[PDB]
């Protein structure tokens, strides 16, 4: 690891600077170095890790979709042959995306998840595991597409079980987990009815628990509840 010689605290400080500079690849490399120091992550540190990789993979996903759309158009009737270049470059981006997903899943498996005992950390990492299997699922087409989908489902399910037992319905981690699992159902598992049911039930149970919250907690929860509502509006 190229970050092996830098102090954990310096890696975290630089992750924060990289975020401020919108240098998300750097931010991710710094956080990977911090994880590899072997200590558990604080809540702030977990969010630095997720913010970094979400931005990196998010750009890769956006590029993959652009290229995939061009590729599909070139494979319609009446399209002029352009050669292998569109497929090759789509494959290049896809391979880089899969590499990032494998890196994140590797950190979670060595050894973030197994050391996470508190609900807030364990649910956070299992949600991440679901998310990065979902990104692999978005590009998968071969003999392991079903296994990738089930790996995503399994991670999300375990996170949901813990979150329902150990967190209030308004907890932002629990809310974001449900939002994303609902999208998994809609976009990956071809289960739009499960997607809609989950989003609705999550929204309504959070609504009923908002009265217990401070003004700052209320803002955090209602922000994610609005995303649930936005998706429901898109889907109904």
């Amino acid at each position: 690891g190229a970050m092996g010689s830098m102090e954990r605290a310096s890696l975290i400080q630089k992750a924060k600077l990289a975020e401020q500079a919108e240098r998300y690849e750097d931010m991710a490399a710094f956080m990977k170095g911090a994880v590899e120091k072997g200590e558990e992550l604080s809540c702030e540190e977990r969010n630095l890790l997720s913010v970094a990789y979400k931005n990196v993979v998010g750009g890769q996903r956006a590029a993959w979709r652009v290229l995939s759309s061009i590729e599909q158009k070139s494979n319609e009737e009446g399209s002029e042959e352009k050669g292998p270049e569109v497929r090759e470059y789509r494959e290049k981006v896809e391979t880089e995306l899969q590499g990032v997903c494998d890196t994140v899943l590797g950190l979670l498996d060595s050894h973030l998840i197994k050391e996470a005992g508190d609900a807030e950390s364990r649910v956070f990492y299992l949600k991440m595991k679901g998310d990065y299997y979902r990104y692999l699922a978005e590009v998968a087409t071969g003999d392991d597409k079903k296994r990738i989908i089930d790996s995503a489902r399994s991670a999300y399910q375990e996170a949901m079980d813990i979150s329902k037992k150990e967190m209030p319905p308004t907890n932002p981690i629990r809310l974001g987990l449900a939002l994303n699992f609902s999208v998994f159902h809609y976009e990956i598992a071809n289960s739009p009815e499960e997607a809609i049911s989950l989003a609705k039930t999550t929204f309504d149970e959070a609504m009923a628990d908002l009265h217990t919250l401070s003004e700052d907690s209320y803002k955090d929860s209602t922000l994610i509840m609005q995303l649930l509502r936005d998706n429901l509006t898109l889907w109904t």
Partner: peptide
């Protein structure tokens, strides 16, 4: 695309 966090 739908919203995720």
């Amino acid at each position: 695309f739908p919203a995720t966090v």
